[PDB]
């Protein structure tokens, strides 16, 4: 039973002996075997008393579980409930990850489940490597470990061992002729993972055992990966390989100098200038066979600086912080290319720093460039548009002015991203559709914020018609959230999530200007929620009528004269007057309610339960339907 399962789980949590013996004996020995072979949802997480004894580290409970009872070690569970949130574990995984050598020792001894394949086909050797303790890995290798497995992330145990801060496991793996040249999911050979967090000893060990230098899926050598992450030590080690070439040496030095310019943990502008100058002097040293820089055409986002192909201009921009920052951005874009994953984040950081210094024009420029790069790479920018809505709120709450082409570009990108978010939601049925739907709703909210700023600025005729074109393009896609709210239900809803950051001030919902903009940009005013409420059943439920009359009045005016049918019944068969938790909303609606005999006759047909099917016009069947 579930109650006795919880009882024995609690007994195993404290690691007791007599309580576990009494609670797992005599009474229904078949059910006792079932309980020791059962997994339950405790604390919202799937776990087993045996696997939690392997987790808690209490010895005697697991000794008497594996000795006084014949319990299998193949019981299901969760490999990690923080950062991984995936099930399918075994006792070996939780024993190794927690860090108990003796527990996993007598767990493998009482049943060798070393080749355990979960839902993500990851063996407990991953837990052994992630724990970092050498003894568990030593024993699991002594149990004839098959070191060839790739996870759902397609990473060998060597890759995760090198990515973590543990080098003893890496040394033990390479000491028995492991695979330091084998490829991971994209391109990683554990060098791209050792040269990501700054583990110089792991890189040294892999280089000593000939891990080789090969580009990854993004064309990034481990030297270039280390240079990208501001790892000066790893770049120093990898620049001495007996085959590095001048072009790669100077591009790694330039990338390191550029990376030092725009970063948070490692932000040094003196190191930026010095590494850029060191790579410049290395270019211009011989005169004969002089190495010349492949200067890209100027980019409007980084001011108008066309790189620095001479030491004179580089020395000129030595003392200029902004020039050095944009030079680092240009060098990163040139070396990495405008398609890398890591080429966009420094641009966003420089934009954020500029925004924090009340500098907004080049902030918008840099963030728009990063947004364009991430859209061309087809990546989730539901946070970048939120950052745009927050900075646009900052440019409005501080009484500044916002350029209309900026809002137009952000709105076009938001419309696009909502379109591919709909594509992602509809393409993936149920595999991870929850996060995709949440991103979709967040992106709709960011669009509504952007429309809210668009209503609170001044625009020319061409800019205003472009903005209205983007709003029309979105509103004709019928964007519905998970509860059914169209893009206008949210604009009239009090319970619309506004971000707690700077959008909480400028962007207030319900909005009388956003609603009118959506209405005259072609929004279906008679749109229906999944609950059944129309766009009017929501505004007349507004709980701040007298305080916010101007918003409440102008929305109800806008909807009714924009075509709202002020008699619709939701799936609970309630008119907007019936679903009006406010006397003022009732007064306003009754002022705007235009009576018709079709509405009264449909109300009498619905209320009297008259069978109208196949006795009325087909177009009128819907009319009786929403009455």
């Amino acid at each position: 039973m579930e109650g006795l399962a919880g009882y024995v789980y609690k007994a195993a949590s404290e690691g007791k002996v007599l309580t576990l013996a009494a609670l797992l004996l005599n009474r229904s020995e078949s059910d006792i075997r079932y309980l020791l072979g059962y997994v339950s949802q405790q604390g919202g997480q799937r776990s087993t008393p045996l696997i939690i004894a392997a987790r808690n580290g209490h010895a005697k409970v697991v000794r008497l579980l594996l000795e006084h009872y014949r319990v299998q070690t193949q019981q299901t569970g969760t490999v990690r409930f923080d950062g991984y949130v995936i099930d399918g574990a075994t006792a070996l995984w939780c024993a190794a990850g927690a860090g108990h050598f003796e527990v996993v020792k007598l767990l493998v001894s009482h049943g060798a489940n070393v080749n355990h394949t979960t839902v993500t086909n990851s063996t407990p050797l991953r837990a052994a490597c992630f724990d970092g303790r050498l003894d568990i890995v030593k024993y699991l290798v002594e149990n004839n470990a098959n070191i060839s497995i790739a996870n759902k992330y397609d990473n060998t145990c060597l890759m995760i061992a090198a990515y973590k801060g543990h080098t003893d496991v890496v040394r033990y793996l390479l000491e028995q002729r492991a695979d330091p040249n084998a490829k991971a999911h994209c391109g990683a050979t554990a060098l791209h993972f050792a040269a990501e967090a700054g583990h110089i000893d792991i890189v040294k060990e892999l280089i000593k055992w000939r891990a080789a230098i090969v580009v990854n899926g993004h064309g990034m050598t481990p030297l270039k990966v280390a240079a990208e992450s501001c790892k000066a030590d790893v770049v120093e080690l990898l620049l001495s390989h007996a085959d590095c070439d001048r072009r790669s040496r100077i591009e790694a030095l330039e990338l390191l100098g550029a990376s030092f310019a725009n970063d948070r943990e490692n932000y040094d502008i003196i190191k930026t200038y010095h590494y850029l100058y060191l790579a410049m002097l290395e270019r211009f040293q011989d005169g004969d066979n002089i190495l010349e820089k492949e200067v890209l055409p100027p980019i409007h986002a980084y001011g108008n600086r066309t790189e620095c192909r001479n030491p004179q201009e580089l020395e000129s921009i030595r003392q200029d912080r902004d020039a050095l920052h944009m030079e680092g951005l240009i060098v990163r874009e040139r070396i990495l290319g405008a398609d890398n994953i890591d080429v966009s984040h420094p641009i966003i950081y420089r934009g954020a720093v500029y925004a924090d210094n009340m500098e907004f024009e080049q902030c918008i420029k840099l963030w728009l460039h990063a947004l364009h790069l991430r859209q061309k790479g087809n990546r989730n920018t539901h946070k970048d548009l939120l950052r745009f809505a927050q900075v646009f709120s900052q440019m409005i709450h501080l009484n500044e002015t916002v350029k209309a082409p900026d809002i137009e570009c952000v709105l076009r990108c938001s419309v696009l991203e909502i379109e591919q978010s709909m594509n992602r939601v509809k393409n993936i049925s149920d595999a991870d559709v929850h996060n995709a739907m949440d991103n979709y709703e967040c992106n709709l909210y960011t669009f509504l914020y952007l429309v809210c700023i668009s209503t609170k600025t001044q625009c020319s005729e061409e800019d205003q018609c472009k903005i209205n074109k983007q709003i029309y393009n979105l509103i004709h896609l019928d964007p519905r959230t998970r509860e059914g709210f169209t893009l206008l239900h949210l604009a009239v809803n009090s319970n619309t999530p506004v971000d707690d950051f700077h959008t909480n001030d400028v962007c207030s919902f319900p909005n009388a200007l956003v609603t009118k903009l959506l209405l005259d940009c072609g929004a279906e005013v008679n749109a229906v929620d999944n609950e059944g409420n129309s766009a009017l059943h929501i505004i007349v439920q507004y709980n701040r009528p007298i305080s916010d009359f101007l918003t409440l009045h102008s929305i109800i005016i806008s909807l009714v004269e924009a075509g709202a049918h002020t008699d619709m019944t939701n799936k609970q068969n309630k008119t907007p007057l019936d679903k009006s938790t406010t006397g003022v909303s009732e007064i306003l609606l009754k002022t705007q309610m235009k009576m018709s005999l079709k509405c009264l006759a449909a109300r009498a047909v619905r209320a009297n339960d008259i069978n109208y099917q196949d006795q009325i016009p087909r177009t009128l069947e819907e009319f009786v339907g929403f009455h």
């Binding site: 720093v353 925004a355 924090d356 950052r387 950051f501």
Partner: peptide
């Protein structure tokens, strides 16, 4: 501050 919210994705 804007630069603080970037640490969520890093």
């Amino acid at each position: 501050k804007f630069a603080d919210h970037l640490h969520k994705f890093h």
